[PDB]
Amino acid sequence: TTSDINQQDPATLQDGGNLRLSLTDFPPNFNILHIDGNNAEVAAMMKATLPRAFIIGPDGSTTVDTNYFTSIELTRTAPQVVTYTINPEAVWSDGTPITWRDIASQIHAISGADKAFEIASSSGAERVASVTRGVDDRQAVVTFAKPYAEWRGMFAGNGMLLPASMTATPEAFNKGQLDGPGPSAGPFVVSALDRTAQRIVLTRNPRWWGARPRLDSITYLVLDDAARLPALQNNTIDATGVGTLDQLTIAARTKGISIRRAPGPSWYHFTLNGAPGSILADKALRLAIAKGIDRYTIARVAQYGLTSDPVPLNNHVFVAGQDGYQDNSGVVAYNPEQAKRELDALGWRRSGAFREKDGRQLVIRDLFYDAQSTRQFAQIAQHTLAQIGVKLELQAKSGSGFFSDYVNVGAFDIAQFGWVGDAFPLSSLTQIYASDGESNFGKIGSPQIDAAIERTLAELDPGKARALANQVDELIWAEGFSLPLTQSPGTVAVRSTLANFGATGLADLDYTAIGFMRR
Amino acid sequence: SPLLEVTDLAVTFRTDGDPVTAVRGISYRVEPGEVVAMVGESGSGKSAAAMAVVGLLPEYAQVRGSVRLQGTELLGLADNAMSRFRGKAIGTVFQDPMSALTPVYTVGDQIAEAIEVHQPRVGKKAARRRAVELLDLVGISQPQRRSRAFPHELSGGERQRVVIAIAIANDPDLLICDDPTTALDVTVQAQILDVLKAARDVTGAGVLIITHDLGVVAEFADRALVMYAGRVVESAGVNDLYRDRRMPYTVGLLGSVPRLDAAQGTRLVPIPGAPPSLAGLAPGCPFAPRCPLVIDECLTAEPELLDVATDHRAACIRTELVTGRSAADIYRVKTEARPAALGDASVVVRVRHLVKTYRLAKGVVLRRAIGEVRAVDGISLELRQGRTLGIVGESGSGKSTTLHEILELAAPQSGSIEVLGTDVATLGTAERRSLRRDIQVVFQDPVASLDPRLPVFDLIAEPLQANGFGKNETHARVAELLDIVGLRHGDASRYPAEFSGGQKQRIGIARALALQPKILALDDPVSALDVSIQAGIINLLLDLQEQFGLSYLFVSHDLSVVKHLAHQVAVMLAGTVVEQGDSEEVFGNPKHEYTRRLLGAVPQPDPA
Amino acid sequence: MTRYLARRLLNYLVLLALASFLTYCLTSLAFSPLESLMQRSPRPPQAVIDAKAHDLGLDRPILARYANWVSHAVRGDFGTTITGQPVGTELGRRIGVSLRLLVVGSVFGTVAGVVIGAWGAIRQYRLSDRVMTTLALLVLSTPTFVVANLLILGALRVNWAVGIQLFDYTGETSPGVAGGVWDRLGDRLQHLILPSLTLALAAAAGFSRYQRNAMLDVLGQDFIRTARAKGLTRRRALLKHGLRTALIPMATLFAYGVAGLVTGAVFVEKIFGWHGMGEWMVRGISTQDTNIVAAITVFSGAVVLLAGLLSDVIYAALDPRVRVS
Amino acid sequence: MTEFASRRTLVVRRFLRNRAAVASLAALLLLFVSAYALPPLLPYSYDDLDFNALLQPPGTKHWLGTNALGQDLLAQTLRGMQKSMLIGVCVAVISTGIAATVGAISGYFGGWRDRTLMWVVDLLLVVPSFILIAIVTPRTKNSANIMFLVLLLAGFGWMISSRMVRGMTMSLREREFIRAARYMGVSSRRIIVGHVVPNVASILIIDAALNVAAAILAETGLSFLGFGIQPPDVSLGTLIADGTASATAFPWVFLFPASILVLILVCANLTGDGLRDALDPASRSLRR
Ligand SMILES: Nc1ncnc2c1ncn2[C@@H]1O[C@H](COP(=O)(O)OP(=O)(O)OP(=O)(O)O)[C@@H](O)[C@H]1O
Numbered sequence A: 001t002t003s004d005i006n007q008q009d010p011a012t013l014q015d016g017g018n019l020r021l022s023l024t025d026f027p028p029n030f031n032i033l034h035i036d037g038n039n040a041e042v043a044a045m046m047k048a049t050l051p052r053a054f055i056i057g058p059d060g061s062t063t064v065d066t067n068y069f070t071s072i073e074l075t076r077t078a079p080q081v082v083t084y085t086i087n088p089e090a091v092w093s094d095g096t097p098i099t100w101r102d103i104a105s106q107i108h109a110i111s112g113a114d115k116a117f118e119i120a121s122s123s124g125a126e127r128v129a130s131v132t133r134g135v136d137d138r139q140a141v142v143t144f145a146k147p148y149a150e151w152r153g154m155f156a157g158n159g160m161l162l163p164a165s166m167t168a169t170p171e172a173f174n175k176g177q178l179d180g181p182g183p184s185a186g187p188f189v190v191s192a193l194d195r196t197a198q199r200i201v202l203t204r205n206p207r208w209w210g211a212r213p214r215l216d217s218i219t220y221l222v223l224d225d226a227a228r229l230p231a232l233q234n235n236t237i238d239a240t241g242v243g244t245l246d247q248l249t250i251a252a253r254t255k256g257i258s259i260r261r262a263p264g265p266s267w268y269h270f271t272l273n274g275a276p277g278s279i280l281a282d283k284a285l286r287l288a289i290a291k292g293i294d295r296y297t298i299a300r301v302a303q304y305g306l307t308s309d310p311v312p313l314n315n316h317v318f319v320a321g322q323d324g325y326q327d328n329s330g331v332v333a334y335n336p337e338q339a340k341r342e343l344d345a346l347g348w349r350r351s352g353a354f355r356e357k358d359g360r361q362l363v364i365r366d367l368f369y370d371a372q373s374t375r376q377f378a379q380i381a382q383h384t385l386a387q388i389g390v391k392l393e394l395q396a397k398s399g400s401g402f403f404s405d406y407v408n409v410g411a412f413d414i415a416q417f418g419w420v421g422d423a424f425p426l427s428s429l430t431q432i433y434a435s436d437g438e439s440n441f442g443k444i445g446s447p448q449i450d451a452a453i454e455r456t457l458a459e460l461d462p463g464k465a466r467a468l469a470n471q472v473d474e475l476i477w478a479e480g481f482s483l484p485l486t487q488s489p490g491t492v493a494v495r496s497t498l499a500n501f502g503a504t505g506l507a508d509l510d511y512t513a514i515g516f517m518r519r
Numbered sequence B: 001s002p003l004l005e006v007t008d009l010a011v012t013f014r015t016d017g018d019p020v021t022a023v024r025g026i027s028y029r030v031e032p033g034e035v036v037a038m039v040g041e042s043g044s045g046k047s048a049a050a051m052a053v054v055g056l057l058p059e060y061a062q063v064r065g066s067v068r069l070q071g072t073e074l075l076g077l078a079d080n081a082m083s084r085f086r087g088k089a090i091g092t093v094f095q096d097p098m099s100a101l102t103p104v105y106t107v108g109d110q111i112a113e114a115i116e117v118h119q120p121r122v123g124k125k126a127a128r129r130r131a132v133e134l135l136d137l138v139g140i141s142q143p144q145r146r147s148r149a150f151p152h153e154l155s156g157g158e159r160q161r162v163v164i165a166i167a168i169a170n171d172p173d174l175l176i177c178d179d180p181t182t183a184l185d186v187t188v189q190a191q192i193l194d195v196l197k198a199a200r201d202v203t204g205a206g207v208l209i210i211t212h213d214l215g216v217v218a219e220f221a222d223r224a225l226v227m228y229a230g231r232v233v234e235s236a237g238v239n240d241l242y243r244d245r246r247m248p249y250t251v252g253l254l255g256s257v258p259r260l261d262a263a264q265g266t267r268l269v270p271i272p273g274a275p276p277s278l279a280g281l282a283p284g285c286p287f288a289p290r291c292p293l294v295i296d297e298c299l300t301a302e303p304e305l306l307d308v309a310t311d312h313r314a315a316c317i318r319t320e321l322v323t324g325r326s327a328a329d330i331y332r333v334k335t336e337a338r339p340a341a342l343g344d345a346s347v348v349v350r351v352r353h354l355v356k357t358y359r360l361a362k363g364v365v366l367r368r369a370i371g372e373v374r375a376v377d378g379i380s381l382e383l384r385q386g387r388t389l390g391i392v393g394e395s396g397s398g399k400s401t402t403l404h405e406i407l408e409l410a411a412p413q414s415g416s417i418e419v420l421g422t423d424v425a426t427l428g429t430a431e432r433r434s435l436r437r438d439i440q441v442v443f444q445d446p447v448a449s450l451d452p453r454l455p456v457f458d459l460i461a462e463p464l465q466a467n468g469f470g471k472n473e474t475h476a477r478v479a480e481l482l483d484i485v486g487l488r489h490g491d492a493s494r495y496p497a498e499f500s501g502g503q504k505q506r507i508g509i510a511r512a513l514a515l516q517p518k519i520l521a522l523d524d525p526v527s528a529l530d531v532s533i534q535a536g537i538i539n540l541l542l543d544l545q546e547q548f549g550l551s552y553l554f555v556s557h558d559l560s561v562v563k564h565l566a567h568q569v570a571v572m573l574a575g576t577v578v579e580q581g582d583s584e585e586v587f588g589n590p591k592h593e594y595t596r597r598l599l600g601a602v603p604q605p606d607p608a
Numbered sequence C: 001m002t003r004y005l006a007r008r009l010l011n012y013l014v015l016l017a018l019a020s021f022l023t024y025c026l027t028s029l030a031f032s033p034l035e036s037l038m039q040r041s042p043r044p045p046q047a048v049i050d051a052k053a054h055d056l057g058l059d060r061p062i063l064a065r066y067a068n069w070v071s072h073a074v075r076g077d078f079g080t081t082i083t084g085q086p087v088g089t090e091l092g093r094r095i096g097v098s099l100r101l102l103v104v105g106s107v108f109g110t111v112a113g114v115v116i117g118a119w120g121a122i123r124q125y126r127l128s129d130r131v132m133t134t135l136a137l138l139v140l141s142t143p144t145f146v147v148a149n150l151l152i153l154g155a156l157r158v159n160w161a162v163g164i165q166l167f168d169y170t171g172e173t174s175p176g177v178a179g180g181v182w183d184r185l186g187d188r189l190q191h192l193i194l195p196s197l198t199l200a201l202a203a204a205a206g207f208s209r210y211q212r213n214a215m216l217d218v219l220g221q222d223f224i225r226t227a228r229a230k231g232l233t234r235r236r237a238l239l240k241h242g243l244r245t246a247l248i249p250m251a252t253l254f255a256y257g258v259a260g261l262v263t264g265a266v267f268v269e270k271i272f273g274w275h276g277m278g279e280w281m282v283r284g285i286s287t288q289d290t291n292i293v294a295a296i297t298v299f300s301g302a303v304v305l306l307a308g309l310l311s312d313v314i315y316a317a318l319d320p321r322v323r324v325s
Numbered sequence D: 001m002t003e004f005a006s007r008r009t010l011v012v013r014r015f016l017r018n019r020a021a022v023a024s025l026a027a028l029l030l031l032f033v034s035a036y037a038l039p040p041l042l043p044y045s046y047d048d049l050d051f052n053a054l055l056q057p058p059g060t061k062h063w064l065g066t067n068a069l070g071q072d073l074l075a076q077t078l079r080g081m082q083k084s085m086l087i088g089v090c091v092a093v094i095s096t097g098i099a100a101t102v103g104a105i106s107g108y109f110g111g112w113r114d115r116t117l118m119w120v121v122d123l124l125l126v127v128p129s130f131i132l133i134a135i136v137t138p139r140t141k142n143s144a145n146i147m148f149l150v151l152l153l154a155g156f157g158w159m160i161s162s163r164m165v166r167g168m169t170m171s172l173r174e175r176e177f178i179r180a181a182r183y184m185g186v187s188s189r190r191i192i193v194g195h196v197v198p199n200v201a202s203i204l205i206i207d208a209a210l211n212v213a214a215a216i217l218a219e220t221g222l223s224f225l226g227f228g229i230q231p232p233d234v235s236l237g238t239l240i241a242d243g244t245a246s247a248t249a250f251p252w253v254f255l256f257p258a259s260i261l262v263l264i265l266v267c268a269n270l271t272g273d274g275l276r277d278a279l280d281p282a283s284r285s286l287r288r
């Protein structure tokens, strides 16, 4: 099911309570579509206060949000016109009705046709031709210039709908809510920002037309990672994230809190530098170095006590719980005798310690930042590669300047950082795995890859698009682009009294049903 | 019950090395209406017996005897019990007045604190008022202005009078005062002894006084105790001891005082020999090595105090011979002045119209002025070469200031200083350092001028290792300086903090007589030395000037020593040279009505 | 000494105005403000990150940037973080928070340290000293994360044994504290107990060693003997005179214990969830902000320089022999 | 002469008759040797990963337990000692030397020397060395960092101690024996190193002793914030930094490296006490 939240019937819970959570920094900007405003946790907090078009299930499957829209449909699909209609009960915090102009204004704001807006991503608004008015003011028809397979993710997942007054001019976008968000329309409203104590309080929305939430308020405390566990230990907050086996042990042996886990979407990888001139500019060398690295031991050791049966990730597009996931790393299976065979049949002879082509030694440079949390993968890979005759010395960078100084300029041979999976994953691949993508930091690509990437996100069939996405994934596995290592387990330590809240995975919570167990 | 009773007291400091048996079994007593004086040689244990009685010896003292104040055996009482007597029944005056005062409290505060310890209902206003009254009674000038003077802003005599005031603040029943008059001139110590007498007559308060001079004893004390090498060695009345002494040591010591009826030269006779080691101390009388009367019996066992007359006791197995005879007879040793004298009159120091002034202020941070002290007011001084100039006068009258204005070779406030031809302002920095190779000084307070973290050898050798001496000369000179002054080899590994106090003063003299300077500035150089030892220092200084032609700037409050070795003297009062000239036209008849008073107030050593 | 003030205020104005020149140029060279935008899965389109670069300067000569900064830094405009939030108002917030956190713990820590060190000098090698010495060294040789976490373990045990929550350590006031005007002060003092304990342990441990070594020099002197001859008990004489003399080297240590720690309590404000001046420096560095760092060096200099005036004043008060100032 | 001994001869004799400080100098310098003689002796080298034995309590093959990666903790902490003890001793010595010379010169002379020296000191205090240590430290993993570290920790660690020494010297230079030494021709550096430094030395010693541990913990404070010595090379500071998190759940990982630091500071304090008693003549312990 991939979800573990201690499901209970909402009606059998308390009619009050105060959920208290923690952040890691006070949100600078309160606009989620702004570069300084988008974030994992800021969006997570806003999801309780803003509209969203679709509800994403435990495996990423989407269904229409009835509380905001009565029906969203793909109408005509010759230019792919999409029709949103809003139910005649949704109103903003100020009391003005939600109409089509909100949709039009938001997707013009993020369309990128005006450079004044400092958008964080385009999210497929770049492909929208025009937005007009349907039968009435509660209906918007969105016409696309070219087909977009991933259109349900425009106002879903991490994307919400913002009021037309906060996305209508560049000033309102960039600085409209620098010090507190604008109107909201969801089960809760933010009504206390204590910038000196750094705590945010969300109370019940008085004009919420949907289900009545069981909670009475949600309180966020800006806590450093060192204070997160001691605060949970004595009734100050009642949910953390126990990333390490250390925190897992301390939380597990604490009376009153129960740890619940579900695979998270973020993962790790090694990224190979195929830029012309690095040792790895040849495909066969990359495919032989990667057949001499044990990703399973990396997983099993770096996820020692967090999970049972720790496995690596074997997909560049989807994650373990997501549907359409499959094992595509069959071309780069571990077996190390073939790495030795191929490196011998490729030129690098075994001169005593490490392989040498002609005097030049087979020596690879590994760059990681955040030394403490990711030394684990640098050191295991080096140990298991030394047995083939590959050096792989570790260059732990500070993390202050990591991308800007090394990765974006190509001064690396293998770089390891993280990506984040999403319920709508197709938009990121045309930026990462394209030849001209802005995140293809290692300059490995082929016209075949581009021709397939700009064919998956053009198929308006929900399942056929997944098949094509796996074609693209099999191709990027076949040229040693990267080696996904492990996706983080979603071990969160929550108070055992909580219900309908916990580790969800790629799925989303609903906030009218989380509460405290009676008595 | 006697007001004090000591019996078989013995103090042996156990430092790193052989233990020093400072005191070995003494016993005496003091009565309420009576002053007892304890004279003796330097290093003989007097100021260790004093601290043993009072109870303020170090942690390693190892005292063992019996001392009782008024029936209460105070040798073993807890500090709480021995802090109900230590201010109200036992008032103590310490030898070194400089180190005895906390350097971060004004002297008025120190006296007021002493007052309010034993009467905490007085307060602070009344306590400070009465402390000011004490400052005036003792005799310090500008009491009100000088009450807030941190001890480093006082003269050497005022700094001692403050300690006396602290001792007599609460009118104690016993006064243990140690040489309470070594930094006071004649006409102020007259009144200090007067106030001690007042404490004897207006109250009870028998006094145990330890002095190195004998004129004070001849008129102040009632009984005498002669102490030598730890033992009390001769005991009698003050009048009977002076004319019927019967112990060879007291014959040699009572007959070696300065005479004041002498001229330049007149080598006074010291006791021939060296002081006892006080560590080995071979069996027999400790004075046997220096005795003209020593026989083989005197060495077998140590003699004890035997009765010889009415209230007269001598520790000497043959005294019937000493009866009647004189020091010139008992000691056939004769001292005659026949040196290789050098005569010249080329100026070496010429001070003209010197002026020095100090500012007086109150407060902790703001420090607003309240007055001034004209320490020097336009003196004119002149010292020839090969001659000495004796600076005498009232305590607190600028004598120590001028000595240190010449010595810091720099342009003074409002005068001119010319040392050995130079004008001190005309000097640079390298010519000045080369110049201070023949000029030295003995500081008035000898313990403060020696740092505590250097052994004795490094203190004496420090001058003559900054001017180019190898470690075969630096060592042969220190070995010969140690025995010139009378110290012992093996004291060169001791730190200055563990010496008697007349021994610390001989260290500073030895440090000054290295490098045989041409001008030697002496700030009361023989004040804490006893009569016999200081006689050999004067004989040393006099005979070291006839040859090598040294010229001393000699300032002291003993107008008898000055008579022996001063060609010219300069009486100095209130910061001005009241009178000056050769020490016959000013010692013979003084034509000014303060130097006549000072010369007419000297204590005559004959009790009758 | 009015003349002295007229000298030192200029001697410190030039110092401040030059130190907050070196830092601005050095951080303009070392810092890369836009990296945080790159370490983001949805990497902002290149256009809107070059636009952000041009927005906050970052392409003008460094001397020109500093000229602009100091142009309105003299009228309170201390700038704006990389994310639009003003810097001056946050500066006020953070200095307030750090003051309230540090005063109680530090002052009681140094008082306790002076007492413990002076006590250990009198009983130089006895069991009391040996025990206190190992305790001080134990505290000084462990990270403060560990000391504070041990405090938290103990407080949790007390809470779980009594049954009532009497130890609330995280934050600065009870999240959702209800009515009261007193019940506010009760809450504040309840939350100050553990942070103050951590700071006081560190301060006492550090100060006791210095006090011990400073007191051993004045232990055996003579004015203590004459103080005892006044009628003072050995204990009272030693304190009133010896300790009064021994405090002179410790004037500096304290006057700099008023400063320096403002930004060095980062780890105490990590575990307990306070936010000021130790968090802000680490945030400035980690976010690569030059305005934050400049606004911090200005204030920290304005404190560490007026702790060099108070220092000379206290030195000539504590010791009259220093005729310096 | 006969048997005349200098001051330093007496100081050495007095120091080596305090047996606590003699013992805790041989210990301090024998575990420095054992930090190099032992690593090529014991079964498991550092950076040897035992994936069979992850996070194990101390036992037979692993005498002090393992790590998260399986690295033998005993070998790891020995290699950490090699780097961290050298840096600690060097920082203590250099910081104390610079503080002593700067404070003594400025305090004893006054005038322009005082003004300019304290100008430089106050400049070094105002500028935040924390960024200069947070950015420079993660540059290059070699001796270069150990070097650049001491240059920065030692160069920005002496200012406070220099102020303390200057304050003490202003009162010391108004003494009477300082004046006597000046009157006798002693040069202003023989005065300083022969009269001022020994009479101020009771606090220099505590500075050295405390700066050992302070320098070792400065490089763990760096590792707590993400700066500091990087993974590939190990130092005792980084070992403690990685242990404090699991100081409660898996105590051995934190306890053993930290207990080494405690022992180092205890010995560095007992030796300091021995020397302090040697230089002070009024010490009561040396009164037999
Ligand atoms: N603290 C000490 N430690 C070791 N020896 C000491 C100490 N104090 C005094 N002595 C030694 O004890 C002996 C006598 O000392 P004391 O001060 O009692 O003599 P004194 O008769 O008072 O001499 P003076 O008349 O010169 O003051 C001397 O040899 C001296 O060196």
Ligand SMILES: Nc1ncnc2c1ncn2[C@@H]1O[C@H](COP(=O)(O)OP(=O)(O)OP(=O)(O)O)[C@@H](O)[C@H]1O
Binding pocket: B152, B153, B154, B155, B156, B157, B158, B183, B184, B358, B359, B373, B375, B394, B395, B396, B397, B398, B399, B400, B401, B402, B444
């Ligand atoms: N630093 C100072 N500040 C203020 N007044 C001082 C200072 N030093 C000395 N005096 C005063 O100047 C006067 C001169 O004292 P000086 O030091 O010359 O002693 P002196 O005349 O030799 O006295 P004695 O013969 O008792 O040693 C004294 O009244 C003293 O109180």
Ligand code: SF4
Binding pocket: B247, B248, B249, B285, B286, B287, B288, B289, B291, B292, B293, B294, B295, B298, B303, B315, B316, B317, B318
């Ligand atoms: S006992 Fe003998 S040696 Fe001693 S003083 Fe008398 S005659 Fe001289």
Ligand SMILES: [Mg+2]
Binding pocket: B046, B047, B048, B095, B500, B501, B502
């Ligand atoms: Mg004496």
Ligand SMILES: [Mg+2]
Binding pocket: B155, B156, B157, B399, B400, B401, B444, B523
């Ligand atoms: Mg004088």
